[PDB]
């Protein structure tokens, strides 16, 4: 027959702090046992306050990002303001569900700030079930990224650690570390790591090289 | 298209200093059979962007006419605006995904080469809507054979002269002919530059069959 | 005889200008935008002491933070009000937030000149709405009041009146408005102007009073509370 | 010459003397517009239009009355310009449909025939009004030669050697008759096209004007395009100096 | 089927076998697969009989109207284009290849292949199930600039060789020659077929 | 079914058996398969019974309506094109294999049309499950320009062969001769099988069947 | 008159009155001025209040990052045309990823605005627009009307008393091409000022400004954001 | 592009009269005369086919038309409108045959054709038919003659006339027509009723006549009409 889907890999990670949000991904686009390109970062600026990360079928991820872009403009002409992080996350849920019977093979994570300036992270499934959380990973290597974050950020399975609040510095290394680990095991993860930092000042991008095999 | 009839194999792309060069062999296969050994799988969209296409040839000729008319329509207005290589790439991406989402795909893989504003363009388009940009491009079996060659050279030498790109391309067509059962030894080279699009006539890659005597 | 989408030599649509005239037969309604809240007030126009008091609803709730005063053809208004209520809840569903007073008014304003005969649906509009509306509420831009008529045109107002006695109440607000007015003075002024322009005496059951202030939501006033604001004549 | 009250409101109503006044009144709109010209030469077709400057605030080149309907086909319009553009869009789609279906450039006569059918269709019903403009179509190839056609609001189309529409269609035609266009090169014809516009122009009723000029012949390789600033200004100077 | 067309100076030559088949049975041993689309444009039929014939009718319909609207005999390019478009629009639903060959004043004698909805002009073209068995022969036996009689033999030879090898091809060889002067339709019977190696 | 068609010197002749099957049991022993279209155009139907019935009646309905509007002798080529465009639209789901024969101003004509909508014009043809038997007889004995009687006998032999060799064929051979003068529908021309005679009486004297309830309604 | 109730009825003079009646709606709206330099396109519009208690009407609207409009006439017809323009600009970015050239967007308005003028039961658009945009060809000032006709202009004014503004710009049209942005806006404001009666002049409450060009995307300055432009004012003379 | 009117062009006047139907009746009352006679063993239908010029080809168009094997038609009124009703009548006759496999009873055809006529007295954007129909038929071994008119009303006749001099033709028939005629007699009294309203000399080209019996319906050949013209 004919399959409307392809698997292109990519893992996306988001973490929430007091006044910052982190959205990070690998730069590898692949298909089968071949790499399409080594220069495909999954982070995308939507507003100065909100950044999205899409992974899975790149055809769906591209069209979906363009839908969101158009929908962002539609909102602002109609409402006279920018669509907030929580509003974008709410809108994304509905867009993904309108395709409940022909879904976007897509894993979306939203990172930004809420109306109080506090860090916000939203994790989605291909069909639009979502919630807010401190940290979440989506994509081919999400199961590799999750447990380490559960232990270190959530302080899970530990007895007398004093429970230190999350700092930007520490989260940055944490983001770097989990991807370094995943690139060693997941064949779909590698090449380079791009981190997008959302703060009150705006969006700053940072690049750290990864395994290229 | 549910089942493609006449197909074309790998299309090549790589960008040199001051332009882009595209290669595709002049073969249209009907299954394993070499049916048409002198047909063009490349077109000049306008004077800034060019296109080579893999997969179903009837779908390529259809897309060739639709894109052909779009360029004509734009030339009629004469408002100082024309389609950039990125604009053609974006349109094609939107076209393929749309057709794919209606479960009636255009059975093609595309390489779009272009030159505009002193910058070289090379974009990939899939039949499912997979789209990206890369310094070198190879579709079908090229992605497994020619693409490794291009990347290994571009790692050692990122900027190539037009001559260096040409000889690299001829070298890749040599590998493709040896290794692809759905290939042929008649091919074309397309080039974008400050001067525009130039498609060159029937070319053959030099072959060597001396290893045929190295089995004793 | 002409069509519903015909321009006057002046440059206006007849049906719109005639819809404006229908409002001049409607009971008077006043809104006041105070820096600490918005008050809406309207006369009921009781035709008989047999009619139930709270039966007439010329000030309604659209959302927790939005109130709407209506004048003109009441039946036309309640079709527009349901549409306003549908929009807020559609927006809530899609965006998980409350709409701005401007956007709510803008949404209702989109139905403005959506009427016609030929080249239209089976259930498409035949005429405009013989209604004027005062959207008053509190969003993240403080307290706001908006005015809308059948031309579709909508604009913010610091204070506005619409209805039969429109010009009389407009002048009375004009000389009695400080942009620094308190909410106590705001309800008072509307009650003072209302009795002047009416054919009937101000009773506790004769009028509707509503407040939308930052702290608390839209509030429909109860007869006992009305007797405390009508205590200060 | 006109009929009041009843017989002139709708195009689905005939007048007692067998006339459709709605078409005739639409024909009046073009008669009020500034003059458009176009004459067939030995090796192509040239177009000339007077464009009345309503205000000096408008750009030089605004309100283009010369269109590219297809690469090899040019359109010259007179009348309600809003209608002229929609017909330019209809004509474009027709030339596009022909290539999509048959694989080559539309023969000009057929293009004219097709667009004329669409124009005519708006002359039969109460539901729509006739188009308030008239337009010319010009092309050149080695096979078909130089061709020139003109369509009016009724839906009529005819071939021409010389043709004019608008304010002074009469003043233009008598000046066109003077030319041996069957023997003239299209480089020469431009000069003469330019002077006829200047003669035709009323500089004491209308305030001022710009001259629009078009190509379609062998010198353009069969493609319809605008006459260069250089060649136009030579023809403009020629027009001003032989006006004495 | 086996179908074939060849281009020469003054015009073209179009040939076909005369068999129609359903499974292993032949239902018509004498069928002419050379349908006129206009006065000097023919087409060669292959694939589904019903699908082919339906395309032939609609092609002949549109070319008649197109011919009258231009008041000129349709271009062979135009003819090929209309057949190509119907074939493409229903490539999943209509299953037939049609070779379109003819003659016009603009471009002389022309041969077009339209299989699957693509369009290509060739010096000569073969089609049908029996075309597989003669790809080698046509490549070896072809010369450019063949006379009408040579082209006539070339098509006859190639179709004879295909029919003998192919089980889905049989009967007689229908030949048409299209020039400026007109159309010459001839039939090559069983006794008249060229002999080759048969063992 | 076995159905066949034949062209001779003075016109055409059509043939058919009279058997209809439901599953593998002979439903009708004397069903009619040669169908009226025009007074001088006839059609033989093979395949899905109801399908060959409705298509043929629909064609005849359109042919009378066409003759009424033109005031002319219906054309058999018109019948053939109407039939095939109808059948092509249904993509072979109407299981009607038809042999159409008649006489025009253009002489005697014979066509065959398959359910998918393909057609062919020829001097002789055969359709249905017994077609193999009929073509065998035709390819063997057909000549151009035969006499009516020589043509009538060969056709009978062709249908007879189908009847005797095919399990989905039986009954009588029906013939229809169409001449430039007129059409004779020779129903039950030849009849090979006969067994109506017997020697077994199975009667029951009024009252052998046990009855529980009786009701009589006067009219 | 009986030739003036439907758009599908031609006047014997060869005219459509319902188009001309819609053209009257534009003239009744408050004045708006558009002008351009070689680098920028500037819109300046006069906000109007029905009463002193009500706020001023919106005159300048967003279309895209590179295109902005100022309205004159019916509000709903302006809002309808604005939404069509936005949708066209969105579709252009969605498909081609590049901004829609101003010329082509206006051509689409010209094609869309033409449709209702030719169908019975329909009506012309009761709004005229001044379009300021920036693309590959530099800055543009365009004009649309109830009649589907549109114009490419160096500068334009539409609305009530726009003739005064039109004459001001006509004197200083050669000035604009080498103008600094701050000098360009003052020219636009000075033309808008001419439209007002002698008693009154431009205030911070009744002036709206839209700017698009090589430097920046389309921006609307309204109240506090407007006074930088008004301050530095050559005095109203006669 | 177009889309029709959706309102009735036939409405009730204060008098309770649908004026457009009566105005349509005037169109038929002014048309060429036509007569039908039911004659015990058959039916005859005749009309004035005077083209009023020698330039016309009298054989080209016909006024007496067959609807099916057993049903025929004549009209008084507008020729173009009549053609529409003939085409509709023929289709209805076939629609009936396909469903029931039996020749449509004349009564049933007339009812179906009359209902089509009714539509145009109520449907939007249309005028009624300016034709009255005379429909003959043979079914169940019985001759039938029916009249349909612009109203959508239908009548059964032993004999009647319509068109020019329909009033004089009717009284003539009252006196002249007697039940239990032979068909060949009916052709005479049909041509005689036609002579009452003629104006000119009758040739076989000037008039058209059709007959219906147990053998079906057919129009008489010009040679047959000449033999009755003595
Ligand atoms: C050669 C002889 C072998 O097929 C040719 O291709 C011939 C060409 C032709 C064209 C026009 C008129 C007559 C003949 N084709 C056929 O003979 C054709 C073969 C065919 C059948 C089915 C196909 O799949 C869709 C493709 C090709 N034969 C027929 O169509 C005959 C008349 N009927 C059938 O076989 C019925 N089919 C319909 C499809 O499903 C299987 C049964
Ligand atoms: C011969 C007898 C079959 O070998 C003919 O083809 C004959 C055609 C005929 C018969 C009467 C009148 C005119 C023409 N065909 C039949 O006898 C036919 C048998 C048949 C059954 C199923 C088929 O597959 C779809 C095809 C043919 N008779 C019938 O159709 C009988 C009366 N009905 C059924 O068997 C029920 N069918 C209805 C269609 O769907 C499958 C079951
Ligand atoms: Cl969406
Ligand atoms: Cl999940
Ligand atoms: Cl090619
Ligand atoms: Cl592919
Ligand atoms: Cl990329
Ligand atoms: Cl070949
Ligand atoms: Cl049929
Ligand atoms: Cl307004
Ligand atoms: Cl104005
Ligand atoms: Cl209506
Ligand atoms: Cl109807
Ligand atoms: Cl008859
Ligand atoms: K295949």
Domain ranges for chain F, please list them.
Answer: 1-219
Phi, psi of A85 (to 5 degrees): -55, -50
CA–CA dist C161, C171 (Å, integer): 10
B79 touches chain D (CB under 8 A): no
Buried b (16+ CB within 10 A) or exposed e, D166-192: bbbbebbeebbeebebeebebbbbbbb
Which of F16, F18, F19, F21, when mutated, tests ligand 2's pocket best, judged by the most ligand atoms within 8 Å of its CB? F21
Residue H113 is encoded by which pair of tokens?
């054709």
Token code pair at residue C217 = 């939501």
If phi > 0 it is left, if psi is from -120 to 50 it is alpha, else beta; for residue G209 that is beta
DSSP lists the bridge partners of residue D159 as: D149
DSSP collapsed to 3 states, chain B:
CCCCCEEECCEEEEEECCEEEEEEECCEEECCEEEECCCCCEEECCCCEEEEEEEEHHHHHHHHHHHHHHHHHHHHHCCCCCCCHHHHHHHHHHHHHHHHHCCCCCCEEEEEEEEECCEEEEEEECCCCCEEECCEEECHHHHCCHHHHHHHHHHHCCCCCHHHHHHHHHHHHHHHHHHCCCCCCCEEEEEEECCEEEEEEEECCCCCCHHHHCCC
Q: Under CATH, to which class is E1-199 assigned?
A: alpha beta
Give residue for tokens 């600026």.
A45
Strands H216-219 and H65-66 come out as unpaired
Alpha carbon separation from G179 to D59, G153, G213, H208 (Å, rounded)? 18, 17, 13, 92
Shortest-distance Cα residue to atom 1 of ligand 1: E1
Q: How big is chain B by its Cα radius of gyration, in Å? A: 17
DSSP string covering G159-215 = STTHHHHHHHHHHSTTTGGG--HHHHHHHHHHHHHHHS-TT----TTTEEEEEEESS
Residue E97 CA to residue D129 CA, distance in Å, equals 48
The DSSP letter of residue C207 is E
Q: What is the DSSP string of G122-155?
A: ----SEEEEEEEEETTEEEEEEE-SSS-EEEESE
From the list F68, F86, F87, the residue with the least C-alpha distance to H93 is: F68
Which residues are CB-neighbours of B48 under 8 A, at least 6 positions away? B82, B83, B84, B85, B114, B115, B116, B192, B196
For residue G78, give the nearest of G113, G108, G107, G52 by alpha carbon.
Answer: G113
Torsions phi, psi for A29 (to 5 deg): -110, 125
Give CA–CA dist G124/G1, Å, rounded: 19
Q: Quick one: residue C47, left, alpha or beta (phi over 0 = left, psi -120 to 50 = alpha)?
A: alpha
CA atoms of B132 and H203, how far apart (whole Å) = 89
Backbone dihedral angles phi then psi of residue H219, each to the nearest 5 degrees: -85, 135
Rounded to whole angstroms, the Cα distance separating F37 from F59 reads: 7
G96 touches chain D (CB under 8 A): no
* Angle at C29 (CA atoms; ends C27, C30), nearest 5 degrees: 160
Q: Which residues line ligand 2 (CB under 6 A)?
A: F 1, 19-22, 27, 31, 33, 45-49, 52-53, 95, 128-129, 168
Which residue ranges form the domains of chain H, and what is each CATH number? 1-230 (3.60.20.10)
H87 Cα–ligand 13 center, Å: 15
Residue H81 carries which DSSP code?
H
Ligand 1 binding pocket includes E128 (Cβ within 6 Å) = yes
> What is the rounded distance in angstroms from the CA atom of residue C80 to the CA atom of residue G235?
49
To the nearest 5 percent, what fractions of chain C are helix, strand and coil? 30, 25, 40
Give the burial string for C149-172 (b: 16+ CB within 10 Å, else e).
bbbbbbbbbbbbbbbbbbeebbeb
DSSP symbol at E157: H
- Chain A residues with beta carbon closer than 8 angstroms to that of C95: 83, 87, 90-91
Q: Do F13 and F176 form a contact (C-beta atoms < 8 A)?
A: yes
Which helix or strand (DSSP H or E) is residue G112 part of? helix G102-118
- For residues A180, A185, A191, A197, the Cα torsion angle rounded to the nearest 10 degrees is -40
The residue to mutate among E28, E44, E46, E48, having the most atoms of ligand 1 within 8 angstroms of its beta carbon, is: E48
CB–CB contact B2 A2 (8 Å): yes
Q: Which stretch of DSSP H or E encloses residue C28?
A: none
CATH number of A1-213, picked from 3.40.50.150, 1.10.357.140, 3.60.20.10, 3.30.70.1710: 3.60.20.10
The CA–CA distances, whole Å, from B179 to B10, B37, B110, B172, G170 equal 12, 17, 21, 11, 72
Cα–Cα distance, A109 to A111 (Å, whole number)? 7
Identify all chain D residues contacting E70, using CB atoms and an 8 Å cutoff.
107, 110
Instruction: Report residues near ion ligand 14: CB below 5 Å.
Output: H 66, 218-219
Experimental method: X-ray
Closest by CA to F6, choosing from F104, F96, F112, F83, is: F112
Q: Which class is domain G1-238?
A: alpha beta
Domain total in chain B: 1
DSSP state string for G24-75: HHHHHSPPEEEEE-SSEEEEEEE---SSSSB-PPP-EEEEETTEEEEEEE-H
Contact C159, C119 (CB under 8 A): no
Question: How many other C-beta atoms can be found within 10 angstroms of the C-beta atom of residue D225?
Answer: 16
Q: Which stretches of chain D are DSSP H helices? A: 21-32, 81-102, 108-121, 169-176, 186-200, 229-241
User: Which tokens hold the place of E24?
Assistant: 């292993």
Separation of alpha carbons G126 and G16, rounded Å: 15
Q: Which CATH class is domain F1-219?
A: alpha beta
Q: In the block, which residue shows the tokens 């539901």? A: D127
Taking the C-alpha atoms of residue A92 and residue A72, their distance in angstroms, rounded to an integer, is: 11
d(CA H94, CA A52): 68
What CA–CA distance (Å, rounded) separates D85 from D64?
Answer: 10
Token pair for C208:
């509707």
Q: What angle do CA C120, C121, C123 make, to 5 degrees?
A: 125
The closest of A21, A19, A98, A9 to A52, measured between CA atoms, is A21
**G27: buried, middle or exposed (CB in 10 Å: 19+, 13-18, 0-12)?**
middle
For chain D, percent helix, then strand, then coil, each to nearest 5?
35, 25, 40
* Euclidean distance between CA atoms D97 and C218, whole angstroms: 61
To which H or E segment does residue D50 belong? strand D44-52
Closest listed residue to residue C65, CA positions, set C109, C101, C31: C101
Do the Cβ atoms of C67 and C136 come closer than 8 Å? yes
Q: Is the CB of E156 under 6 A from ligand 1?
A: no
Beta carbons of A11 and A185 less than 8 angstroms apart:
no
Sketch the domain layout of chain G as residue ranges.
Answer: 1-238
Ligand located closest to F92 CA: 1
Nearest to D174 by CA among D158, D166, D187, D162: D162
The conformation of residue H196, written as its DSSP 8-state character, comes to T
* Contacts with F86 (C-beta within 8 Å, 6 or more apart), sequence order: F55, F58, F59, F94
- Report the alpha-carbon distance of residue B38 to residue H2 in Å, rounded: 51
| CATH number where D227 lies | 3.60.20.10
Supply the Cα-derived Rg of chain A in whole angstroms. Answer: 17
The token pair that represents H109 in the structure block: 């055809």
For residue F117, the 8-state DSSP code is S
Phi-psi category of residue H195: left, alpha or beta, with phi > 0 → left and psi -120 to 50 → alpha: alpha
DSSP H or E segment with residue H73: strand H71-77
Contact D99, D106 (CB under 8 A): yes
> E31 vs F120: CB contact, 8 Å cut-off?
yes
d(CA E179, CA E9): 9
Helix (H), strand (E), coil (C) string for A110-135: EEEECCCCCEEEEEECCCCCEEECCE
Q: Residues of H with CB below 8 A from F71's CB?
A: 62
Q: Is G85 helix (H, G, I), strand (E, B) or coil?
A: helix
Q: CA–CA separation, H72 vs H137, rounded Å?
A: 7
Nearest to B83, CA basis, from B68, B61, B96, B62: B68
Q: Are B149 and B171 in contact (CB under 8 A)?
A: yes
Give phi and psi for B61, each to the nearest 5: -65, -35
Residue partners of F101: CB distance under 8 A and separation at least 6: F5, F7, F12, F13, F14, F41, F42, F43, F44, F76, F108, F109, F110, F111, F176, F178
Region of C11 (left: φ > 0; alpha: ψ -120 to 50; beta: rest) is left
Q: What is the DSSP string of D157-192?
A: EEE-SEEEESTTHHHHHHHHTTS-TTT--HHHHHHH
Torsions phi, psi for C44 (to 5 deg): -80, -35
CB G129 within 8 A of CB G72: yes
Rounded CA-CA distance H113/H129 in Å is 12
- Give the C-alpha separation, A26 to F79, whole Å: 70
Residues in CB range of B22: below 8 A, 6 or more apart: B11, B12, B13, B42, B50, B51, B52, B111, B113, B189, B190, B191
Separation in Å, CA E35 to CA E3, E40, E44, E100: 12, 11, 7, 10
Residue A95 Cα, ligand 3 centroid: separation in angstroms? Answer: 5
Q: Are strands F20-22 and F11-16 parallel, antiparallel or unpaired?
A: unpaired
Contacts of residue F21, Cβ cutoff 8 Å, sequence gap at least 6: F27, F168
CA dist D120 and D111 (Å) reads 14
E1 is an active site residue: yes
3-class secondary structure, G88: helix
Strand partners, G131: G69, G142
- Residue G183 CB neighbours (<10 A): 12
Q: At A140, phi and psi to the nearest 5?
A: -65, -25
Task: Assign a CATH topology to domain C1-233.
Answer: 3.60.20
Are the beta carbons of H57 and H50 closer than 8 angstroms? no
DSSP-derived secondary structure letter, A108? E
Give per-residue burial for F53-79: e unless 16+ CB within 10 Å, then b: bebbbebbbbbbbbbbeeeeebbbbbb
F61: closest chain H residue by CA: H94
- On the 0-12 / 13-18 / 19+ scale of CB atoms within 10 A, G179 is buried
Cβ contacts of D152-156, under 8 Å, gap ≥ 24: D152/D27, D152/D30, D152/D119, D153/D23, D153/D26, D153/D27, D153/D29, D153/D30, D153/D79, D153/D119, D153/D123, D154/D23, D154/D27, D154/D119, D154/D120, D154/D123, D154/D130, D155/D116, D155/D117, D155/D119, D155/D120, D155/D121, D155/D123, D156/D116
Return phi, psi of residue C113, to 5°.
-100, 30
What radius of gyration do chain H's Cα atoms show? Answer: 18
H144: nearest Cα among H103, H172, H185, H173: H103
Q: At B216, which CATH number?
A: 3.60.20.10
Neighbouring residues of A63: CB distance < 8 A, sequence distance ≥ 6: B94, B97, B129
∠ Cα A114 A116 A122 (to 5°): 20
CA distance A86 to C95: 8
């Amino acid at each position: 027959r004919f399959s409307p889907y392809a698997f292109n890999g990519g893992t996306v990670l988001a973490i929430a702090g007091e006044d910052f949000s982190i959205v990070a991904s690998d730069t590898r686009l692949s298909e089968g046992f071949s790499i399409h390109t080594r220069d495909s970062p999954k982070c995308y600026k939507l507003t100065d306050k909100t950044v999205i990360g899409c992974s899975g079928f790149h055809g769906d991820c591209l069209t979906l990002t363009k839908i969101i872009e158009a929908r962002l403009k539609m909102y602002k002409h109609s409402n006279n303001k920018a669509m907030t992080t929580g509003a974008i996350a709410a809108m994304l849920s509905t867009i993904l569900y309108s395709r409940r019977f022909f879904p976007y093979y897509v894993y979306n994570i939203i990172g930004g700030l809420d109306e109080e300036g506090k860090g916000a992270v939203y994790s989605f499934d291909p069909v639009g079930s979502y919630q807010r959380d401190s940290f979440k990973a989506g994509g081919s290597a999400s199961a590799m990224l999750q447990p380490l974050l559960d232990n270190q950020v959530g302080f899970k399975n530990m007895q007398n650690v004093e429970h230190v609040p999350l700092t930007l510095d520490r989260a940055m290394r944490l983001v770097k570390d989990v991807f370094i680990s995943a690139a060693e095991r997941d064949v779909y993860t590698g090449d380079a790591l791009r981190i997008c930092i959302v703060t009150k000042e705006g969006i700053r991008e940072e690049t750290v090289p990864l395994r290229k095999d | 298209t549910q089942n493609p009839m006449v197909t074309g194999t790998s299309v090549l792309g790589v960008k040199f200093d001051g332009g882009v060069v595209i290669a595709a062999d002049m073969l249209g296969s009907y299954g394993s059979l070499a049916r048409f050994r002198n047909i063009s799988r490349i077109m000049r969209v306008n004077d800034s962007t060019m296109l080579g296409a893999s997969g179903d040839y009837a779908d390529f000729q259809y897309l060739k006419q639709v894109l052909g008319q779009m360029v004509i329509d734009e030339e009629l207005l004469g408002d100082g605006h024309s389609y950039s290589p990125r604009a053609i790439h974006s349109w094609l991406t939107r076209a393929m995904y749309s057709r794919r989402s209606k479960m009636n795909p255009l059975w093609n893989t595309m390489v779009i080469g272009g030159y505009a504003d002193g910058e070289s363009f090379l974009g990939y388009v899939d039949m499912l809507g997979v789209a990206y940009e890369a310094p070198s491009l190879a579709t079908g079996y090229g992605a497994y054979l020619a693409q490794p060659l291009l990347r290994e050279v571009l790692e050692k030498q990122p900027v190539l002269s037009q001559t260096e790109a040409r000889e690299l391309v001829e070298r890749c067509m040599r590998v493709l002919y040896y290794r692809d059962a759905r290939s042929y030894n008649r091919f074309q080279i397309a080039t974008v530059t400050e001067k525009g699009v130039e498609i060159e006539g029937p070319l053959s890659a030099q072959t060597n069959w001396d290893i045929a005597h190295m089995i004793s | 005889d002409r069509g519903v989408n015909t321009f006057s030599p002046e440059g206006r649509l007849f049906q719109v200008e005639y819809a404006i005239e229908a409002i001049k037969l409607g009971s008077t309604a006043i809104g006041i935008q105070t820096s600490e809240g918005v008050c809406l007030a309207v006369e009921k126009r009781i035709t008989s002491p047999l009619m139930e008091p709270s039966s007439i609803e010329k000030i309604v709730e659209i959302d927790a933070h939005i109130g709407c005063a209506m004048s003109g053809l009441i039946a036309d208004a309640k079709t527009l009000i349901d549409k306003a209520r549908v929009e807020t809840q559609n927006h809530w569903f899609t965006y998980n937030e409350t709409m701005t007073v401007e956007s709510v008014t803008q949404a209702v304003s989109n139905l403005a000149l959506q009427f016609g005969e030929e080249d239209a649906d089976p259930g498409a509009m035949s005429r405009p709405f013989g209604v004027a509306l005062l959207f008053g509420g509190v969003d993240e831009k403080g307290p706001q009041l908006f005015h809308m008529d059948p031309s579709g045109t909508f604009v913010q107002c610091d204070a506005r009146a619409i209805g039969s006695a429109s010009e009389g109440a407009q002048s009375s607000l004009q000389e009695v408005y400080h942009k620094s007015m308190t909410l106590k003075e705001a309800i008072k002024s509307s009650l003072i102007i209302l009795k002047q322009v009416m054919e009937e005496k101000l009773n506790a059951t004769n009028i509707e009073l509503a407040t939308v202030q930052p702290g608390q939501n839209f509030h429909m006033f109860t007869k006992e509370e009305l007797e405390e604001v009508i205590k200060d004549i | 010459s006109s009929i009041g009250t009843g017989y002139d409101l709708s195009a689905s109503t005939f007048s007692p003397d067998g006339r459709v006044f709605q078409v005739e009144y639409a024909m009046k709109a073009v008669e009020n517009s500034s003059t458009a010209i176009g004459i067939r030469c030995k090796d192509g077709v040239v177009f000339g239009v007077e464009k009345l400057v309503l205000s000096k605030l408008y750009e030089e080149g605004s309100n283009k009355r010369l269109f590219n309907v297809d690469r090899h086909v040019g359109m010259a319009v007179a009348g309600l310009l809003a209608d002229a553009r929609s017909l330019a869009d209809i004509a474009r789609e027709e030339a596009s449909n022909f290539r999509s279906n048959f694989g080559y450039n539309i023969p000009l006569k057929h293009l004219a025939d097709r667009v004329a059918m669409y124009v005519h269709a708006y002359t039969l019903y109460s539901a729509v009004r006739p188009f308030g403009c008239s337009f010319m179509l010009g092309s050149y190839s080695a096979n078909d030669g130089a061709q020139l056609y003109m369509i009016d609001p009724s839906g009529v189309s005819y071939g021409y050697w010389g043709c004019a529409i608008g304010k002074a269609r009469q003043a233009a035609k008598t000046e066109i008759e003077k030319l041996q266009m069957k023997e003239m090169t299209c480089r020469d014809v431009v000069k003469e096209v330019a002077k006829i516009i200047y003669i035709v122009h009323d500089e004491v009723k209308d305030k001022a004007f710009e001259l629009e000029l078009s190509w379609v012949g062998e010198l353009t390789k069969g493609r319809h395009e605008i006459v260069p600033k250089d060649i136009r200004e030579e023809a403009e100077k020629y027009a001003k100096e032989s006006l004495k | 089927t086996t179908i074939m067309a060849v281009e020469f100076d003054g015009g073209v030559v179009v040939g076909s076998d005369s068999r129609v088949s359903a499974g292993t049975a032949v239902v018509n041993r004498v069928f002419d697969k050379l349908s006129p689309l206009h006065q000097r444009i023919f087409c060669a039929l292959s694939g589904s009989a019903a699908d082919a014939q339906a395309i032939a009718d609609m092609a002949a319909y549109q070319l008649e109207l197109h011919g009258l609207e231009l008041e000129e005999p349709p271009l062979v390019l135009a003819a090929a284009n209309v057949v190509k478009n119907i074939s493409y629009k229903y490539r999943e639903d209509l299953l037939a290849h049609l070779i379109v060959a003819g003659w016009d004043q603009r471009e002389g004698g022309q041969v077009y292949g339209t299989m699957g909805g693509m369009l290509i002009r060739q010096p000569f073209t073969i089609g049908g199930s029996g075309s597989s068995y003669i790809y080698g022969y046509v490549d070896a036996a072809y010369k450019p600039g063949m006379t009408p009689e040579e082209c006539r033999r070339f098509t006859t030879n190639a179709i004879t060789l295909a029919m003998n090898r192919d089980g889905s091809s049989g009967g007689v060889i229908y030949l048409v020659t299209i020039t400026a002067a007109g159309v010459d339709h001839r039939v090559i019977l069983g006794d008249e077929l060229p002999k080759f190696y048969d063992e | 079914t076995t159905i066949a068609g034949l062209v001779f010197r003075d016109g055409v002749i059509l043939g058919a058996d009279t058997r209809a099957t439901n599953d593998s049991v002979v439903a009708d022993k004397s069903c009619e398969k040669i169908h009226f279209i025009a007074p001088k155009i006839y059609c033989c139907g093979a395949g899905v019974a109801a399908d060959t019935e409705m298509t043929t009646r629909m064609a005849a309905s359109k042919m009378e309506l066409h003759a009424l509007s033109t005031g002319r002798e219906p054309r058999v080529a018109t019948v053939t094109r109407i039939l095939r465009q109808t059948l092509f639209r249904y993509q072979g789901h109407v299981g009607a294999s038809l042999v159409v024969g008649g006489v025009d101003l253009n002489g005697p004509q014979l066509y065959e049309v398959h359910p998918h909508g393909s057609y062919s014009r020829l001097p002789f043809t055969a359709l249905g499950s017994g077609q193999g038997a009929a073509v065998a007889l035709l390819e063997d004995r057909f000549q151009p320009n035969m006499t009516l009687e020589a043509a009538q006998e060969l056709l009978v032999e062709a249908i007879t062969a189908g009847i005797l060799s095919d399990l989905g064929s039986g009954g009588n051979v029906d013939a229809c001769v169409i001449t430039a003068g007129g059409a004779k529908l020779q129903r039950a021309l030849s009849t090979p099988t006969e067994p109506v005679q017997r020697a077994g009486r199975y009667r029951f004297a009024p009252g052998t069947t046990p009855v529980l309830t009786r009701e009589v309604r006067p009219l | 008159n009986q030739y003036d109730n439907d758009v599908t009825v031609w006047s014997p003079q060869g005219r459509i009155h319902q188009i001309e009646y819609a053209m009257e709606a534009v003239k009744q709206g408050s004045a708006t001025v558009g002008l351009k330099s070689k680098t920028h396109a500037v819109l300046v519009a006069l906000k109007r209040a029905q009463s002193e208690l009500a706020a001023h009407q919106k005159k300048i609207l967003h279309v895209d990052n590179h295109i902005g409009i100022s309205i004159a006439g019916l509000t709903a017809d302006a809002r309808l045309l604005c939404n069509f323009m936005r949708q066209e600009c969105l579709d252009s970015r969605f498909v081609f990823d590049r901004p829609l050239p101003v010329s082509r967007l206006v051509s689409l308005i010209g094609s869309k605005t033409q449709i209702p003028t030719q169908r019975y039961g329909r009506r012309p658009y009761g709004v005229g627009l001044l379009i300021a945009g920036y693309d590959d060809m530099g800055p543009h000032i365009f004009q649309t009307c109830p009649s589907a006709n549109y114009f490419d202009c160096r500068a334009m004014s539409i609305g009530a008393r726009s003739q005064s503004a039109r004459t001001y710009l006509e004197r200083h049209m050669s000035e604009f091409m080498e103008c600094n942005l701050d000098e360009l806006v003052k020219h636009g404001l000075r033309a808008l000022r001419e439209t007002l009666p002698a008693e009154q002049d431009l205030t911070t409450k009744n002036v709206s400004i839209g700017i698009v060009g090589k430097d920046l995307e389309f921006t609307i300055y309204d109240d506090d954001d407007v006074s930088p432009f008004l301050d530095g004012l050559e005095e109203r003379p006669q | 592009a177009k889309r029709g009117y959706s309102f009735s062009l036939t409405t009730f006047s204060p008098s309770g009269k649908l004026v457009q139907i009566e105005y349509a009746l005037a169109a038929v009352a002014g048309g060429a005369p036509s007569v039908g006679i039911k004659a015990a063993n058959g039916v005859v239908l005749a009309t004035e086919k005077k083209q009023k010029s020698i330039l016309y080809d009298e054989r080209s168009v016909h006024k007496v038309e067959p609807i099916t094997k057993h049903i025929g038609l004549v009209y008084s009124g507008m020729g173009p409108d009549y053609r529409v009703l003939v085409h509709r009548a023929r289709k209805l006759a076939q629609q009936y045959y396909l469903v029931y496999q039996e020749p449509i009873p004349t009564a049933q055809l007339v009812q179906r054709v009359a209902s089509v006529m009714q539509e145009y007295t109520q449907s939007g954007g249309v005028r009624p038919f300016g034709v009255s129909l005379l429909i003959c038929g043979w079914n169940e071994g019985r001759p039938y003659l029916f009249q349909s008119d612009p109203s959508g009303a239908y009548f059964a006749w032993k004999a009647t006339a319509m068109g020019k001099n329909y009033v004089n033709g009717k009284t003539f028939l009252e006196k002249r027509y007697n039940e239990d005629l032979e068909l060949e007699d009916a052709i005479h009294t049909a041509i005689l009723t036609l002579k009452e309203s003629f104006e000119g000399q009758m040739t076989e080209d000037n008039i058209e006549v059709g007959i219906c019996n147990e053998a079906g319906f057919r129009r008489l050949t010009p040679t047959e009409v000449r033999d009755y013209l003595a």
